[PDB]
Write a protein that binds this DNA or RNA. Structure first.
Length: 406
DNA sequence: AGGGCGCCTATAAAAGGGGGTGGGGGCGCGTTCGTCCTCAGTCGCGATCGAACACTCGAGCCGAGCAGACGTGCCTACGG
Protein backbone atom coordinates (compact mmCIF):
# COMPACT_ATOMS: atom_id res chain seq x y z
CA UNK A 1 0.00 0.00 0.00
CA UNK A 2 1.49 3.31 -1.20
CA UNK A 3 0.38 6.61 0.25
CA UNK A 4 1.62 9.56 -1.81
CA UNK A 5 2.03 13.07 -0.44
CA UNK A 6 -1.00 15.33 -0.52
CA UNK A 7 0.31 17.61 -3.30
CA UNK A 8 0.85 14.55 -5.50
CA UNK A 9 -2.45 12.90 -4.63
CA UNK A 10 -4.09 16.21 -5.57
CA UNK A 11 -2.11 16.39 -8.85
CA UNK A 12 -0.98 19.97 -8.03
CA UNK A 13 1.28 21.99 -10.35
CA UNK A 14 4.22 22.10 -10.73
CA UNK A 15 4.52 18.55 -9.37
CA UNK A 16 2.23 17.35 -12.17
CA UNK A 17 2.69 19.52 -15.27
CA UNK A 18 -0.44 20.04 -17.39
CA UNK A 19 1.49 20.40 -20.63
CA UNK A 20 5.06 19.79 -21.80
CA UNK A 21 6.52 21.12 -25.07
CA UNK A 22 9.22 19.29 -27.09
CA UNK A 23 12.04 20.91 -25.09
CA UNK A 24 10.53 19.88 -21.73
CA UNK A 25 9.94 16.35 -23.07
CA UNK A 26 13.59 16.04 -24.09
CA UNK A 27 14.57 17.32 -20.63
CA UNK A 28 12.02 15.09 -18.84
CA UNK A 29 13.34 14.34 -15.35
CA UNK A 30 16.50 16.27 -16.21
CA UNK A 31 15.62 19.92 -15.38
CA UNK A 32 18.49 22.24 -16.13
CA UNK A 33 19.46 25.03 -13.70
CA UNK A 34 17.64 28.09 -15.05
CA UNK A 35 18.50 31.67 -14.08
CA UNK A 36 16.15 33.54 -11.75
CA UNK A 37 14.62 36.85 -12.93
CA UNK A 38 14.14 38.21 -9.43
CA UNK A 39 14.96 37.34 -5.83
CA UNK A 40 18.34 37.07 -4.12
CA UNK A 41 19.91 34.59 -6.54
CA UNK A 42 18.93 36.63 -9.61
CA UNK A 43 21.74 38.99 -8.55
CA UNK A 44 25.34 38.69 -9.78
CA UNK A 45 28.31 37.66 -7.66
CA UNK A 46 28.89 35.13 -4.84
CA UNK A 47 26.02 33.88 -2.75
CA UNK A 48 26.18 32.18 0.64
CA UNK A 49 25.71 28.42 0.94
CA UNK A 50 23.79 27.88 4.21
CA UNK A 51 24.06 25.06 6.80
CA UNK A 52 20.98 22.95 7.52
CA UNK A 53 22.04 20.97 10.63
CA UNK A 54 20.07 23.01 13.19
CA UNK A 55 17.06 23.03 10.87
CA UNK A 56 17.25 19.25 10.22
CA UNK A 57 17.35 18.40 13.95
CA UNK A 58 14.55 20.85 14.76
CA UNK A 59 12.18 19.42 12.11
CA UNK A 60 12.85 15.84 13.20
CA UNK A 61 12.15 16.94 16.79
CA UNK A 62 8.92 18.83 15.89
CA UNK A 63 7.67 15.85 13.85
CA UNK A 64 8.32 13.38 16.71
CA UNK A 65 6.48 15.63 19.17
CA UNK A 66 3.48 15.86 16.85
CA UNK A 67 3.66 12.06 16.79
CA UNK A 68 3.64 11.74 20.58
CA UNK A 69 0.92 14.39 20.83
CA UNK A 70 -1.68 12.11 19.19
CA UNK A 71 -0.51 10.07 21.07
CA UNK A 72 1.86 7.59 19.49
CA UNK A 73 1.89 5.17 16.60
CA UNK A 74 2.03 6.08 12.94
CA UNK A 75 1.75 9.56 11.49
CA UNK A 76 1.61 10.81 7.92
CA UNK A 77 3.79 13.91 7.51
CA UNK A 78 3.75 14.78 3.79
CA UNK A 79 0.74 17.13 3.73
CA UNK A 80 2.03 20.35 2.14
CA UNK A 81 4.50 21.25 -0.63
CA UNK A 82 6.76 22.56 2.16
CA UNK A 83 6.97 19.04 3.65
CA UNK A 84 8.54 17.84 0.36
CA UNK A 85 11.69 19.98 0.63
CA UNK A 86 15.13 18.36 0.62
CA UNK A 87 15.96 20.71 3.50
CA UNK A 88 14.85 18.25 6.21
CA UNK A 89 14.20 14.57 6.93
CA UNK A 90 16.72 11.84 6.20
CA UNK A 91 17.78 11.86 2.55
CA UNK A 92 19.02 9.22 0.12
CA UNK A 93 20.11 9.51 -3.51
CA UNK A 94 19.04 7.05 -6.20
CA UNK A 95 20.92 6.94 -9.51
CA UNK A 96 19.00 5.21 -12.33
CA UNK A 97 21.08 2.91 -14.54
CA UNK A 98 18.47 3.06 -17.36
CA UNK A 99 18.89 6.26 -19.37
CA UNK A 100 15.09 6.50 -19.69
CA UNK A 101 13.27 3.83 -17.68
CA UNK A 102 9.70 3.02 -18.72
CA UNK A 103 8.13 4.61 -15.59
CA UNK A 104 9.38 7.38 -13.30
CA UNK A 105 7.91 9.04 -10.20
CA UNK A 106 7.05 12.74 -10.04
CA UNK A 107 8.16 14.87 -7.10
CA UNK A 108 5.84 14.17 -4.18
CA UNK A 109 5.27 10.50 -4.93
CA UNK A 110 6.26 7.71 -2.55
CA UNK A 111 8.07 4.40 -2.92
CA UNK A 112 8.99 1.65 -0.47
CA UNK A 113 12.27 -0.19 -0.07
CA UNK A 114 11.86 -3.95 0.34
CA UNK A 115 14.69 -6.23 1.40
CA UNK A 116 14.05 -9.54 -0.36
CA UNK A 117 15.74 -12.45 1.37
CA UNK A 118 15.77 -16.18 0.64
CA UNK A 119 16.30 -18.44 3.65
CA UNK A 120 19.27 -20.78 3.85
CA UNK A 121 18.31 -24.44 4.05
CA UNK A 122 17.59 -25.92 7.46
CA UNK A 123 18.20 -23.55 10.36
CA UNK A 124 18.10 -20.02 8.98
CA UNK A 125 18.95 -17.39 11.64
CA UNK A 126 17.25 -14.66 9.58
CA UNK A 127 18.09 -11.97 7.06
CA UNK A 128 20.98 -9.53 7.61
CA UNK A 129 19.81 -6.11 8.75
CA UNK A 130 19.94 -3.13 6.38
CA UNK A 131 19.90 0.59 7.18
CA UNK A 132 16.87 1.06 4.93
CA UNK A 133 13.71 -0.84 4.09
CA UNK A 134 11.60 -3.70 5.38
CA UNK A 135 12.71 -7.35 5.10
CA UNK A 136 10.56 -9.66 2.98
CA UNK A 137 10.99 -13.42 3.17
CA UNK A 138 10.22 -14.80 -0.26
CA UNK A 139 9.99 -18.39 -1.41
CA UNK A 140 9.17 -17.26 -4.96
CA UNK A 141 11.11 -14.55 -6.79
CA UNK A 142 9.55 -11.14 -7.50
CA UNK A 143 12.19 -10.80 -10.25
CA UNK A 144 13.02 -12.56 -13.54
CA UNK A 145 15.78 -14.54 -11.87
CA UNK A 146 15.61 -16.38 -8.54
CA UNK A 147 17.35 -15.46 -5.31
CA UNK A 148 19.98 -17.93 -4.09
CA UNK A 149 19.71 -19.27 -0.50
CA UNK A 150 21.07 -16.71 1.95
CA UNK A 151 20.93 -13.94 -0.65
CA UNK A 152 19.65 -10.49 0.31
CA UNK A 153 18.55 -8.13 -2.47
CA UNK A 154 17.24 -4.61 -1.83
CA UNK A 155 14.59 -3.12 -4.09
CA UNK A 156 12.32 -0.17 -4.81
CA UNK A 157 8.69 -1.24 -4.76
CA UNK A 158 5.67 0.86 -5.73
CA UNK A 159 2.73 0.89 -8.12
CA UNK A 160 4.79 1.91 -11.16
CA UNK A 161 7.67 -0.55 -10.94
CA UNK A 162 9.87 -2.75 -8.83
CA UNK A 163 13.61 -2.51 -9.31
CA UNK A 164 16.64 -3.93 -7.57
CA UNK A 165 18.76 -1.31 -5.91
CA UNK A 166 22.32 -1.47 -4.60
CA UNK A 167 23.62 0.65 -1.72
CA UNK A 168 26.80 2.64 -2.42
CA UNK A 169 28.83 5.39 -0.70
CA UNK A 170 28.75 8.98 -1.93
CA UNK A 171 32.23 10.12 -2.96
CA UNK A 172 34.03 12.17 -0.28
CA UNK A 173 34.20 15.11 -2.68
CA UNK A 174 30.44 15.50 -3.09
CA UNK A 175 27.65 17.41 -1.35
CA UNK A 176 24.02 18.13 -2.10
CA UNK A 177 23.20 21.75 -2.91
CA UNK A 178 19.59 22.90 -2.63
CA UNK A 179 18.90 26.05 -4.61
CA UNK A 180 15.96 28.42 -4.25
CA UNK A 181 15.23 31.98 -5.31
CA UNK A 182 16.26 32.96 -1.75
CA UNK A 183 19.59 31.17 -1.31
CA UNK A 184 21.69 28.01 -1.46
CA UNK A 185 21.68 25.33 1.24
CA UNK A 186 24.03 22.39 1.63
CA UNK A 187 23.57 18.91 3.06
CA UNK A 188 25.91 16.02 3.58
CA UNK A 189 24.58 12.93 1.83
CA UNK A 190 26.32 9.57 2.26
CA UNK A 191 23.86 6.92 1.02
CA UNK A 192 23.33 6.62 -2.72
CA UNK A 193 21.59 3.68 -4.36
CA UNK A 194 22.22 2.45 -7.90
CA UNK A 195 18.87 1.48 -9.46
CA UNK A 196 18.93 -1.52 -11.80
CA UNK A 197 16.52 -2.11 -14.68
CA UNK A 198 12.82 -1.70 -13.85
CA UNK A 199 10.21 -4.43 -13.69
CA UNK A 200 7.22 -2.34 -14.81
CA UNK A 201 3.99 -2.94 -12.87
CA UNK A 202 1.97 -0.30 -14.65
CA UNK A 203 1.19 -0.35 -18.37
CA UNK A 204 2.22 2.71 -20.42
CA UNK A 205 -0.40 3.62 -23.08
CA UNK A 206 0.34 3.99 -26.79
CA UNK A 207 0.14 7.36 -28.59
CA UNK A 208 -3.52 8.16 -29.45
CA UNK A 209 -4.80 4.98 -27.81
CA UNK A 210 -8.26 5.15 -26.22
CA UNK A 211 -6.57 4.94 -22.85
CA UNK A 212 -4.30 7.97 -23.59
CA UNK A 213 -7.20 10.04 -24.93
CA UNK A 214 -9.36 9.15 -21.97
CA UNK A 215 -6.53 10.21 -19.65
CA UNK A 216 -5.93 13.72 -21.03
CA UNK A 217 -9.66 14.26 -21.08
CA UNK A 218 -10.05 13.21 -17.41
CA UNK A 219 -6.93 15.18 -16.32
CA UNK A 220 -8.30 18.29 -18.05
CA UNK A 221 -11.61 17.67 -16.28
CA UNK A 222 -9.82 17.48 -12.92
CA UNK A 223 -7.91 20.72 -13.59
CA UNK A 224 -11.21 22.43 -14.40
CA UNK A 225 -12.99 21.29 -11.20
CA UNK A 226 -9.98 22.42 -9.18
CA UNK A 227 -10.16 25.83 -10.90
CA UNK A 228 -13.76 26.24 -9.74
CA UNK A 229 -12.74 25.15 -6.23
CA UNK A 230 -10.01 27.80 -6.14
CA UNK A 231 -12.37 30.57 -7.25
CA UNK A 232 -13.38 32.83 -4.36
CA UNK A 233 -16.23 34.36 -6.33
CA UNK A 234 -19.83 33.32 -5.50
CA UNK A 235 -21.09 31.90 -7.80
CA UNK A 236 -17.72 30.34 -8.67
CA UNK A 237 -16.31 31.26 -12.05
CA UNK A 238 -13.19 30.60 -14.12
CA UNK A 239 -11.53 32.04 -17.21
CA UNK A 240 -11.01 30.16 -20.49
CA UNK A 241 -7.65 31.91 -20.76
CA UNK A 242 -6.38 30.15 -17.62
CA UNK A 243 -7.33 26.74 -19.00
CA UNK A 244 -5.86 27.49 -22.45
CA UNK A 245 -2.58 28.62 -20.85
CA UNK A 246 -2.34 25.27 -18.98
CA UNK A 247 -3.42 23.26 -22.02
CA UNK A 248 -2.06 25.23 -25.03
CA UNK A 249 -2.43 22.25 -27.39
CA UNK A 250 -6.18 21.99 -26.78
CA UNK A 251 -8.61 23.82 -29.07
CA UNK A 252 -11.02 26.21 -27.37
CA UNK A 253 -13.80 24.01 -28.78
CA UNK A 254 -12.57 20.89 -27.01
CA UNK A 255 -12.28 22.85 -23.76
CA UNK A 256 -15.87 24.10 -24.19
CA UNK A 257 -16.88 20.40 -24.20
CA UNK A 258 -15.50 19.86 -20.70
CA UNK A 259 -17.26 23.07 -19.54
CA UNK A 260 -20.69 22.73 -21.10
CA UNK A 261 -22.11 20.39 -18.46
CA UNK A 262 -20.96 22.29 -15.38
CA UNK A 263 -20.87 25.95 -16.44
CA UNK A 264 -22.46 28.85 -18.34
CA UNK A 265 -20.69 31.30 -20.63
CA UNK A 266 -21.18 34.89 -19.44
CA UNK A 267 -20.39 37.49 -22.12
CA UNK A 268 -19.09 40.95 -21.21
CA UNK A 269 -18.04 43.96 -23.26
CA UNK A 270 -14.33 43.08 -23.14
CA UNK A 271 -12.17 40.25 -24.50
CA UNK A 272 -12.26 38.45 -21.19
CA UNK A 273 -15.37 36.47 -20.37
CA UNK A 274 -16.23 34.09 -17.60
CA UNK A 275 -17.54 30.59 -17.24
CA UNK A 276 -19.83 30.61 -14.20
CA UNK A 277 -20.67 27.40 -12.34
CA UNK A 278 -24.30 26.33 -12.90
CA UNK A 279 -26.37 26.76 -9.70
CA UNK A 280 -27.77 23.21 -9.95
CA UNK A 281 -24.36 21.61 -10.57
CA UNK A 282 -22.77 20.04 -7.49
CA UNK A 283 -19.00 20.38 -7.48
CA UNK A 284 -17.24 17.05 -6.83
CA UNK A 285 -15.64 16.59 -3.42
CA UNK A 286 -11.86 16.45 -2.88
CA UNK A 287 -12.23 12.69 -2.42
CA UNK A 288 -14.20 12.28 -5.66
CA UNK A 289 -11.77 14.37 -7.70
CA UNK A 290 -8.81 12.29 -6.50
CA UNK A 291 -10.60 9.10 -7.57
CA UNK A 292 -10.86 10.47 -11.12
CA UNK A 293 -7.15 10.35 -11.98
CA UNK A 294 -4.23 8.94 -10.01
CA UNK A 295 -0.57 10.05 -9.90
CA UNK A 296 0.34 6.68 -11.48
CA UNK A 297 -1.90 7.33 -14.49
CA UNK A 298 -0.20 10.71 -15.01
CA UNK A 299 3.21 8.97 -14.82
CA UNK A 300 2.17 6.40 -17.46
CA UNK A 301 0.97 9.21 -19.73
CA UNK A 302 4.10 11.33 -19.24
CA UNK A 303 6.18 8.29 -20.14
CA UNK A 304 4.35 7.93 -23.46
CA UNK A 305 4.58 11.53 -24.64
CA UNK A 306 8.26 11.79 -23.67
CA UNK A 307 9.06 8.59 -25.56
CA UNK A 308 6.94 9.79 -28.47
CA UNK A 309 8.98 12.97 -28.60
CA UNK A 310 12.31 11.07 -28.58
CA UNK A 311 11.03 8.87 -31.42
CA UNK A 312 10.03 11.89 -33.56
CA UNK A 313 13.47 13.41 -32.94
CA UNK A 314 15.07 10.18 -34.23
CA UNK A 315 13.04 10.35 -37.44
CA UNK A 316 10.30 7.85 -36.55
CA UNK A 317 6.90 9.08 -37.69
CA UNK A 318 3.49 8.43 -36.17
CA UNK A 319 2.95 5.79 -38.88
CA UNK A 320 5.75 3.75 -37.26
CA UNK A 321 3.72 3.50 -34.02
CA UNK A 322 6.68 -5.49 -38.89
CA UNK A 323 8.11 -3.02 -36.37
CA UNK A 324 11.38 -1.01 -36.24
CA UNK A 325 13.98 -1.86 -33.55
CA UNK A 326 13.78 1.60 -32.03
CA UNK A 327 9.98 1.40 -31.74
CA UNK A 328 10.42 -1.86 -29.78
CA UNK A 329 12.21 0.10 -27.08
CA UNK A 330 9.16 2.33 -26.55
CA UNK A 331 7.56 2.05 -23.08
CA UNK A 332 4.16 1.12 -24.49
CA UNK A 333 5.80 -1.96 -26.03
CA UNK A 334 8.23 -2.92 -23.27
CA UNK A 335 5.73 -2.50 -20.41
CA UNK A 336 3.02 -4.36 -22.35
CA UNK A 337 5.43 -7.20 -23.10
CA UNK A 338 6.71 -7.47 -19.52
CA UNK A 339 3.26 -7.39 -17.91
CA UNK A 340 1.83 -9.99 -20.31
CA UNK A 341 4.76 -12.27 -19.44
CA UNK A 342 4.19 -11.70 -15.73
CA UNK A 343 0.61 -12.95 -16.22
CA UNK A 344 1.89 -16.04 -18.05
CA UNK A 345 0.43 -14.93 -21.38
CA UNK A 346 3.85 -15.24 -23.14
CA UNK A 347 7.61 -15.30 -22.65
CA UNK A 348 10.24 -12.59 -23.20
CA UNK A 349 13.07 -12.41 -25.74
CA UNK A 350 15.45 -11.45 -22.88
CA UNK A 351 18.40 -11.26 -25.28
CA UNK A 352 17.52 -8.66 -27.91
CA UNK A 353 17.43 -5.12 -29.24
CA UNK A 354 15.43 -3.69 -26.32
CA UNK A 355 18.22 -4.39 -23.76
CA UNK A 356 18.59 -0.87 -22.31
CA UNK A 357 22.28 -1.34 -21.41
CA UNK A 358 23.30 -2.23 -24.97
CA UNK A 359 25.86 -4.64 -23.49
CA UNK A 360 24.02 -7.71 -22.18
CA UNK A 361 23.54 -6.62 -18.58
CA UNK A 362 19.86 -5.86 -19.02
CA UNK A 363 16.72 -7.56 -20.32
CA UNK A 364 15.02 -7.15 -23.69
CA UNK A 365 11.28 -6.89 -23.02
CA UNK A 366 9.88 -8.29 -26.29
CA UNK A 367 7.10 -10.91 -26.47
CA UNK A 368 7.87 -14.43 -27.62
CA UNK A 369 5.16 -17.17 -27.57
CA UNK A 370 4.89 -19.86 -24.89
CA UNK A 371 5.61 -22.40 -27.70
CA UNK A 372 11.03 -29.86 -25.68
CA UNK A 373 8.49 -27.41 -24.27
CA UNK A 374 10.01 -28.17 -20.89
CA UNK A 375 13.33 -27.30 -22.50
CA UNK A 376 11.84 -24.15 -24.02
CA UNK A 377 10.86 -22.78 -20.61
CA UNK A 378 14.00 -24.05 -18.88
CA UNK A 379 16.09 -22.10 -21.42
CA UNK A 380 14.07 -18.97 -20.77
CA UNK A 381 14.65 -19.34 -16.99
CA UNK A 382 18.34 -20.12 -17.48
CA UNK A 383 18.88 -16.97 -19.55
CA UNK A 384 16.82 -14.83 -17.17
CA UNK A 385 18.84 -16.21 -14.29
CA UNK A 386 22.19 -15.46 -15.94
CA UNK A 387 21.33 -11.81 -16.68
CA UNK A 388 19.71 -11.38 -13.27
CA UNK A 389 22.94 -12.54 -11.61
CA UNK A 390 25.13 -10.47 -13.95
CA UNK A 391 23.24 -7.24 -13.16
CA UNK A 392 23.41 -7.82 -9.38
CA UNK A 393 27.12 -8.52 -9.53
CA UNK A 394 28.05 -5.51 -11.73
CA UNK A 395 25.83 -2.96 -10.04
CA UNK A 396 26.83 -4.02 -6.47
CA UNK A 397 30.55 -4.05 -7.27
CA UNK A 398 32.88 -1.45 -5.77
CA UNK A 399 35.59 -2.06 -8.38
CA UNK A 400 37.24 1.12 -9.68
CA UNK A 401 37.21 1.47 -13.50
CA UNK A 402 39.23 3.22 -15.48
CA UNK A 403 38.08 5.95 -17.84
CA UNK A 404 37.45 4.85 -21.43
CA UNK A 405 39.72 7.13 -23.52
CA UNK A 406 37.62 6.80 -26.74
C1' DA B 1 54.68 -151.90 -9.14
C1' DG B 2 55.50 -152.07 -13.76
C1' DG B 3 54.91 -153.32 -18.81
C1' DG B 4 52.17 -153.06 -22.56
C1' DC B 5 48.56 -151.00 -24.54
C1' DG B 6 45.73 -146.24 -25.25
C1' DC B 7 46.16 -141.65 -26.45
C1' DC B 8 48.62 -137.54 -28.16
C1' DT B 9 51.33 -135.39 -31.65
C1' DA B 10 51.61 -134.94 -37.77
C1' DT B 11 49.59 -135.81 -43.14
C1' DA B 12 45.95 -135.73 -46.99
C1' DA B 13 40.98 -135.88 -48.44
C1' DA B 14 35.82 -136.32 -48.72
C1' DA B 15 31.06 -136.21 -46.61
C1' DG B 16 27.13 -132.02 -44.36
C1' DG B 17 25.28 -129.78 -40.41
C1' DG B 18 25.65 -127.84 -36.88
C1' DG B 19 27.55 -124.49 -34.01
C1' DG B 20 30.00 -120.34 -32.97
C1' DT B 21 31.79 -115.74 -33.96
C1' DG B 22 31.97 -111.46 -36.40
C1' DG B 23 30.19 -108.02 -39.47
C1' DG B 24 26.65 -105.71 -41.97
C1' DG B 25 22.16 -104.34 -42.85
C1' DG B 26 17.75 -103.13 -41.75
C1' DC B 27 14.34 -101.27 -39.04
C1' DG B 28 12.51 -98.19 -35.78
C1' DC B 29 12.65 -94.18 -32.95
C1' DG B 30 14.08 -89.74 -31.80
C1' DT B 31 15.87 -85.40 -32.78
C1' DT B 32 16.49 -81.50 -35.44
C1' DC B 33 15.17 -78.20 -38.65
C1' DG B 34 12.06 -75.47 -40.98
C1' DT B 35 7.85 -73.16 -41.48
C1' DC B 36 3.97 -70.75 -39.80
C1' DC B 37 1.57 -67.90 -36.65
C1' DT B 38 1.13 -64.33 -33.39
C1' DC B 39 2.28 -60.12 -31.30
C1' DA B 40 4.17 -55.69 -31.20
C1' DG B 41 5.67 -51.57 -33.13
C1' DT B 42 5.91 -48.18 -36.56
C1' DC B 43 4.36 -45.67 -40.37
C1' DG B 44 1.10 -43.77 -43.34
C1' DC B 45 -3.27 -41.99 -44.58
C1' DG B 46 -7.53 -39.86 -43.77
C1' DA B 47 -10.72 -37.10 -41.20
C1' DT B 48 -11.94 -33.76 -37.86
C1' DC B 49 -11.11 -29.79 -35.03
C1' DG B 50 -9.07 -25.52 -33.86
C1' DA B 51 -6.92 -21.22 -34.83
C1' DA B 52 -6.14 -17.27 -37.49
C1' DC B 53 -7.32 -13.88 -40.72
C1' DA B 54 -10.34 -10.99 -43.14
C1' DC B 55 -14.40 -8.32 -43.78
C1' DT B 56 -18.23 -5.59 -42.37
C1' DC B 57 -20.74 -2.59 -39.38
C1' DG B 58 -21.25 0.73 -35.89
C1' DA B 59 -19.79 4.38 -32.97
C1' DG B 60 -17.16 8.19 -31.69
C1' DC B 61 -14.41 12.11 -32.39
C1' DC B 62 -12.86 16.00 -34.72
C1' DG B 63 -13.21 19.70 -37.70
C1' DA B 64 -15.59 23.21 -40.15
C1' DG B 65 -19.23 26.32 -40.93
C1' DC B 66 -23.02 29.11 -39.57
C1' DA B 67 -25.55 31.83 -36.47
C1' DG B 68 -26.08 34.81 -32.71
C1' DA B 69 -24.54 38.21 -29.59
C1' DC B 70 -21.75 41.98 -28.25
C1' DG B 71 -18.88 45.78 -29.05
C1' DT B 72 -17.09 49.50 -31.71
C1' DG B 73 -17.21 52.81 -35.26
C1' DC B 74 -19.45 55.74 -38.53
C1' DC B 75 -23.29 58.18 -40.34
C1' DT B 76 -27.71 60.24 -40.05
C1' DA B 77 -31.46 62.25 -37.63
C1' DC B 78 -33.47 64.58 -33.83
C1' DG B 79 -33.54 67.80 -30.20
C1' DG B 80 -32.19 71.89 -27.91
Amino acid sequence: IIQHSIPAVELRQPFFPTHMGPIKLRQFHRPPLKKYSFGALSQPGPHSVQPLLKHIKKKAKMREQERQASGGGEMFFMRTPQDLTGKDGDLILAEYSEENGPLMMQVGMATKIKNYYKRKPGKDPGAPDCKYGETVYCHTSPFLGSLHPGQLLQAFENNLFRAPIYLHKMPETDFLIIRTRQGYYIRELVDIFVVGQQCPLFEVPGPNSKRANTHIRDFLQVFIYRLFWKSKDRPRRIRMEDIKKAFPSHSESSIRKRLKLCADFKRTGMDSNWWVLKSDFRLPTEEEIRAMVSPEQCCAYYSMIAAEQRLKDAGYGEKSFKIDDEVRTAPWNTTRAFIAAMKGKCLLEVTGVADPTGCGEGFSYVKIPNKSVAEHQERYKEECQRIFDLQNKVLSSTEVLSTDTD
